[PDB]
Design an enzyme around this catalytic site. Structure first.
Site, PDB file in Angstrom:
ATOM      1  N   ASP A  37       0.827  -1.225   0.000  1.00 32.63           N
ATOM      2  CA  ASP A  37       0.000   0.000   0.000  1.00 32.63           C
ATOM      3  C   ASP A  37       0.846   1.254   0.000  1.00 32.63           C
ATOM      4  O   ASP A  37       1.709   1.485   0.899  1.00 32.63           O
ATOM      5  CB  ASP A  37      -1.032  -0.034   1.162  1.00 32.63           C
ATOM      6  CG  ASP A  37      -2.175   0.930   0.978  1.00 32.63           C
ATOM      7  OD1 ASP A  37      -1.965   2.092   0.543  1.00 32.63           O
ATOM      8  OD2 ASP A  37      -3.343   0.569   1.244  1.00 32.63           O
ATOM      9  N   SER A  86      -7.115   4.439  -1.311  1.00 30.42           N
ATOM     10  CA  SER A  86      -6.961   2.993  -1.231  1.00 30.42           C
ATOM     11  C   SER A  86      -8.240   2.191  -1.531  1.00 30.42           C
ATOM     12  O   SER A  86      -8.189   1.018  -1.965  1.00 30.42           O
ATOM     13  CB  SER A  86      -6.270   2.567   0.125  1.00 30.42           C
ATOM     14  OG  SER A  86      -4.981   3.235   0.281  1.00 30.42           O
ATOM     15  N   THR A 151      -8.035  -1.969   1.723  1.00 23.96           N
ATOM     16  CA  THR A 151      -7.471  -3.014   0.895  1.00 23.96           C
ATOM     17  C   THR A 151      -8.052  -4.405   1.087  1.00 23.96           C
ATOM     18  O   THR A 151      -8.547  -5.010   0.133  1.00 23.96           O
ATOM     19  CB  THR A 151      -5.902  -3.040   1.049  1.00 23.96           C
ATOM     20  OG1 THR A 151      -5.392  -1.745   0.869  1.00 23.96           O
ATOM     21  CG2 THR A 151      -5.229  -3.906   0.063  1.00 23.96           C
ATOM     22  N   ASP A 315       2.066   2.620   3.556  1.00 19.95           N
ATOM     23  CA  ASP A 315       1.334   3.795   3.278  1.00 19.95           C
ATOM     24  C   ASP A 315       1.287   4.701   4.488  1.00 19.95           C
ATOM     25  O   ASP A 315       1.541   5.917   4.404  1.00 19.95           O
ATOM     26  CB  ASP A 315      -0.096   3.370   2.848  1.00 19.95           C
ATOM     27  CG  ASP A 315      -0.939   4.537   2.402  1.00 19.95           C
ATOM     28  OD1 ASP A 315      -0.552   5.246   1.431  1.00 19.95           O
ATOM     29  OD2 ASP A 315      -2.068   4.767   2.896  1.00 19.95           O
ATOM     30  N   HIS A 319       2.619   8.524   4.820  1.00 19.69           N
ATOM     31  CA  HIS A 319       1.712   9.624   5.215  1.00 19.69           C
ATOM     32  C   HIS A 319       2.332  10.555   6.271  1.00 19.69           C
ATOM     33  O   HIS A 319       2.104  11.746   6.265  1.00 19.69           O
ATOM     34  CB  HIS A 319       0.375   9.083   5.734  1.00 19.69           C
ATOM     35  CG  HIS A 319      -0.585   8.731   4.656  1.00 19.69           C
ATOM     36  ND1 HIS A 319      -0.974   9.634   3.681  1.00 19.69           N
ATOM     37  CD2 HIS A 319      -1.200   7.564   4.361  1.00 19.69           C
ATOM     38  CE1 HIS A 319      -1.798   9.021   2.842  1.00 19.69           C
ATOM     39  NE2 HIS A 319      -1.939   7.775   3.225  1.00 19.69           N
ATOM     40  N   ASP A 356      -1.350  -0.250  -4.803  1.00 19.48           N
ATOM     41  CA  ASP A 356      -2.644   0.371  -5.140  1.00 19.48           C
ATOM     42  C   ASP A 356      -2.483   1.748  -5.702  1.00 19.48           C
ATOM     43  O   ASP A 356      -3.290   2.179  -6.513  1.00 19.48           O
ATOM     44  CB  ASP A 356      -3.603   0.376  -3.953  1.00 19.48           C
ATOM     45  CG  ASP A 356      -3.031   1.031  -2.746  1.00 19.48           C
ATOM     46  OD1 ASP A 356      -1.800   1.286  -2.701  1.00 19.48           O
ATOM     47  OD2 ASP A 356      -3.755   1.440  -1.827  1.00 19.48           O
ATOM     48  N   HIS A 432      -1.371  10.793  -1.423  1.00 20.32           N
ATOM     49  CA  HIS A 432      -0.897   9.732  -2.288  1.00 20.32           C
ATOM     50  C   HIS A 432      -0.265  10.435  -3.535  1.00 20.32           C
ATOM     51  O   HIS A 432      -0.393  11.668  -3.722  1.00 20.32           O
ATOM     52  CB  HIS A 432      -2.077   8.841  -2.701  1.00 20.32           C
ATOM     53  CG  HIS A 432      -2.640   7.965  -1.592  1.00 20.32           C
ATOM     54  ND1 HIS A 432      -3.828   7.290  -1.730  1.00 20.32           N
ATOM     55  CD2 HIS A 432      -2.256   7.793  -0.305  1.00 20.32           C
ATOM     56  CE1 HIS A 432      -4.085   6.619  -0.612  1.00 20.32           C
ATOM     57  NE2 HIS A 432      -3.163   6.939   0.280  1.00 20.32           N
TER      58      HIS A 432
HETATM   59 ZN   LIG Z   1      -3.464   2.767  -0.393  1.00 19.68          ZN
HETATM   60 ZN   LIG Z   2      -4.038  -0.684   2.515  1.00 19.80          ZN
HETATM   61 ZN   LIG Z   3      -3.034   6.362   2.233  1.00 18.81          ZN
END
Ligand SMILES: [Zn+2]
Ligand SMILES: [Zn+2]
Ligand SMILES: [Zn+2]
Ligand SMILES: *[C@@H]1O[C@H](CO)[C@@H](O)[C@H](O)[C@H]1NC(C)=O
Length: 476
Positions: A37, A86, A151, A315, A319, A356, A432
């Protein structure tokens, strides 16, 4: 030393490997889908070098899935945003249809945060896990996130807002929990969730009520509807005459009797599982460990299985511009891919790795070979302050000091697992990144992934090779 002869042999060998590629034009029995991710191509490069830093190979190191012969690019835009979240992406790469930001398992007719849309079946998209189940094959999901996170949710849920992981989140948005099923509910009461053989990750909190206390920590649950979903799940398996196990720690997971266990639910945290660099190794199983047990269980099915394994906190670390931790999560997944490869047969098993969507990580110059990827790159010629090799386009790492100068990172900063590397555009949570991401594939029909594809192509190709679903099929 890396001289002319060295590179020429290095290249000749790769060419020799490429020429020896043997195509696999046979049905896939099994499909193991790894999802990093927010794992941008830049994350993969940086992680390759990070790994090299541990093994001493440095820039010559290889990421496990880069040994695959087939790589491809995936275009991640969705139906309403250039840069996908996501949820919409999971709907694309697991159900074969692109959709709006925040929506899972419904098409672009969906209006986010509007539950009515999740009541209309004509708007449903169905996952590759559904398809495997309709074909009489086993399914499961492993992740380092809450099992109700976007996810894993893409493999089983249909909701108008990814935020609705439990009924308390539905109520928070003014929707009627009585009729708007939250993701945790859908996992235990609806297909395909209710038929998964293996469910692993975190998120215990969405499965029991505020009046009840968490295994392990005694934290009150989030449910506001009195439902104890874990005991519901267990009762369901038992009333079918199947054996089931619920585990919440490493030792217990590893003690599971594989041969005599039909269903396995392992929820190792109240929330997301602890990061690689902060987790108690005694209490928490690693991603490869979860993967191993999942494969151990699902492979008992002689007709085949689908498994999703997510490296999910990649992810979360991006972030917060916490790049060191992001790379550690990435390698935990790289190790899981290796665990899977060593346990399955490539003549019958597709192993696919993708992201993703990406993150705005960049790799600046100009450090020397063998430089720790998390180190300084040099000194700016505009303000005379150090800058790191790695940095971001977006996030909370952007920092103007009290004097109105650019924050200068220190040696201490670099070692700190919570240090936020610099960004170009300040935001409390990094956005993202919209750049195409990678896909890497091994096994039957891996040659269906050669070029550049829309992100939703992925499960259509995988279905064709596994002979599941209602589209073109190899067995067709
Ligand atoms: Zn994601
Ligand atoms: Zn995820
Ligand atoms: Zn994210
Ligand atoms: C949500 O969708 C329904 C069903 O078509 C509609 O009646 C309702 O007004 C919509 N609500 C909002 C806030 O748009």
């Amino acid at each position: 030393e890396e001289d002319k002869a060295y590179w020429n042999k290095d290249a000749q060998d790769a060419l020799d490997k490429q020429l020896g590629i043997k195509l696999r034009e046979k049905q896939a029995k099994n499909v193991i889908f790894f999802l990093g991710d927010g794992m941008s191509l830049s994350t993969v490069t940086a992680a390759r070098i990070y790994k090299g830093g541990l093994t001493g190979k440095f820039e010559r190191e290889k990421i496990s899935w880069e040994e695959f012969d087939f790589a491809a690019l995936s275009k991640t835009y969705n139906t309403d945003k250039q840069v996908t979240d996501s949820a919409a992406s999971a709907t694309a790469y697991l159900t074969g249809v692109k959709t709006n930001q925040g929506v899972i398992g419904l098409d672009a007719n969906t209006v986010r945060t509007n539950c009515s849309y999740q009541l209309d079946e004509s708007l449903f998209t169905y996952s590759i896990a559904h398809w495997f189940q309709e074909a009489g094959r086993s399914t499961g999901v492993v992740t380092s996130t809450r099992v109700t996170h976007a996810t894993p949710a893409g493999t089983y849920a249909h909701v108008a807002d990814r935020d609705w992981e439990n009924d308390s989140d539905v109520v928070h948005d003014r929707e009627d929990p009585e009729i708007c099923d939250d993701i945790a509910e859908q996992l235990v009461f609806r297909e395909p969730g209710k038929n998964f053989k293996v469910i692993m990750g975190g998120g215990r909190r969405g499965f029991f009520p505020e009046e009840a206390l968490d295994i392990e920590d005694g934290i009150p649950g989030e449910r506001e509807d009195g439902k104890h979903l874990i005991t519901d799940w267990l009762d369901d398996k038992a009333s079918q005459g199947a054996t089931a196990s619920y585990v919440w720690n490493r030792d217990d997971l590893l003690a599971v009797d594989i041969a005599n266990t039909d269903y396995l639910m392992g929820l190792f945290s109240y929330t997301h599982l602890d990061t690689v660099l902060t987790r108690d190794a005694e209490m928490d199983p690693t991603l490869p460990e979860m993967t191993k047990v999942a494969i151990e269980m699902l492979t008992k099915d002689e007709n085949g299985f689908f498994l999703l394994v997510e490296g999910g906190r990649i992810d979360h670390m991006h972030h917060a511009n916490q790049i060191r931790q992001s790379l550690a999560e990435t390698l935990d997944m790289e190790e899981a891919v290796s665990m899977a490869l060593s346990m399955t047969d490539p003549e019958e098993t597709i192993i696919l790795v993708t992201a993703d969507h990406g993150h705005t990580l960049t790799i600046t110059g100009y450090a020397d070979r063998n430089t720790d990827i998390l180190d300084f790159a040099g000194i700016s010629d505009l303000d005379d302050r150090r800058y790191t090799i790695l940095d971001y386009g977006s996030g909370p790492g952007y920092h103007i000091t009290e004097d109105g100068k650019r924050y200068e990172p220190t040696e201490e900063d670099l070692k700190d697992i919570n240090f936020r590397y610099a960004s170009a555009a300040p935001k409390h949570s990094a956005t993202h990144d919209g750049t195409d991401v990678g896909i890497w594939v091994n096994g039957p029909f891996a040659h269906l992934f050669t070029g550049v594809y829309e992100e939703n192509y992925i499960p259509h190709a995988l279905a064709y090779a596994a002979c599941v679903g209602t589209g073109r099929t190899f067995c067709d």
